[PDB]
C-alpha cells in the first residue's frame, strides 16, 4: 500500500495549494508512514480556515479503529514530543471514561501533527459529569458547569478533540441521530445570550442566519484560562455554496476546484466566535 500513500500525498500537496498553503513533505510523510495501517479504511477530510489559522490546511484521518491510541502512535514515531502537561494524559482518561468507539488524528500539511479526535457513537454520548472527574481535564470545564447545565447539553458530549500544539480541547454537542442540542441555542435570543455569557463577540447577522441551519456546536477550552476560549456553530450540507454566508476566496476554491470529487458528499462548515470576532472553517471530504 506504498503507492496508495503516494496518491494520497499528491492529493494533500495539491489541496494545500488550492487554499494557498505549501505542504511540508518532511512533516507529512512521517505521519503517512506512522498511520499507514489505518489510512485505507479511514475517513479523510481537509479543513480550511479564515483568520490567523489560514496559514495552514488541516488534514484529518477519522473513524480510526478502537485499539489505535492515536497520540501513542504519534509519540512512538517521534511526530510529537513527550510532555508532563495534562494535555498528554487526557486522551487515555477520556477513552476509558467516556463511551469512545472510534478516533482520529489531525495535522497541518505545513505544521505537522496537532490533534487527536475521540468519538463516541451517536447512540451513547459522553457526559460533563464524567469529564470533570478526570485528573487531566481543564479546570475550565467545571468552571463553566453552569453554562453546560443552563443550555441542557451536559449529557450530550458527541466528540472530544485535543490540540497538543495549542494546549486546547474541543467538546462537541449534538450530531447524527443522537440527543439534540436544545432549539433555543440556535434562535437569536439564545445565540446572543450564549455569546454574551461567554464574553464573546456579539453575533453578526450572517452568524444568526447560519445558526438557523445548525444543530451541532462545540466549545474550545484550555488549561490556562477559566474562560471558554471560543464557541463554534456547525452546519453540515452537500451544498456549501448555498450557505447564508459570504465565502472566503480560498473556501470557494476548495469547494469548486479540489483535486477530487465530492459529488453528493456533505461538507462541514463552522463559524467560531471569539472575544475579537468571527472566523470560519470548512471541511471537504476526500475519502468517505
Ligand atoms: Cl477548532
Ligand atoms: Cl429543543
Ligand atoms: Cl469547524
Ligand atoms: Cl465545524
Ligand atoms: Cl481571537
Ligand atoms: Mg439516542
From TrEMBL:
Alphabetically list the UniProt keywords: Prenyltransferase, Transferase
Give one GO molecular function term. Answer: prenyltransferase activity
Q: Which Pfam families match?
A: PTase_Orf2 (PF11468)
> N6,N6-dimethyllysine (modified residue): where?
14, 66, 82, 115, 124, 127, 133, 150, 227, 281
Q: Which residues carry this modification: N6-methyllysine?
A: 115
Record's family? Belongs to the aromatic prenyltransferase family.
Q: What is this protein called?
A: Prenyltransferase
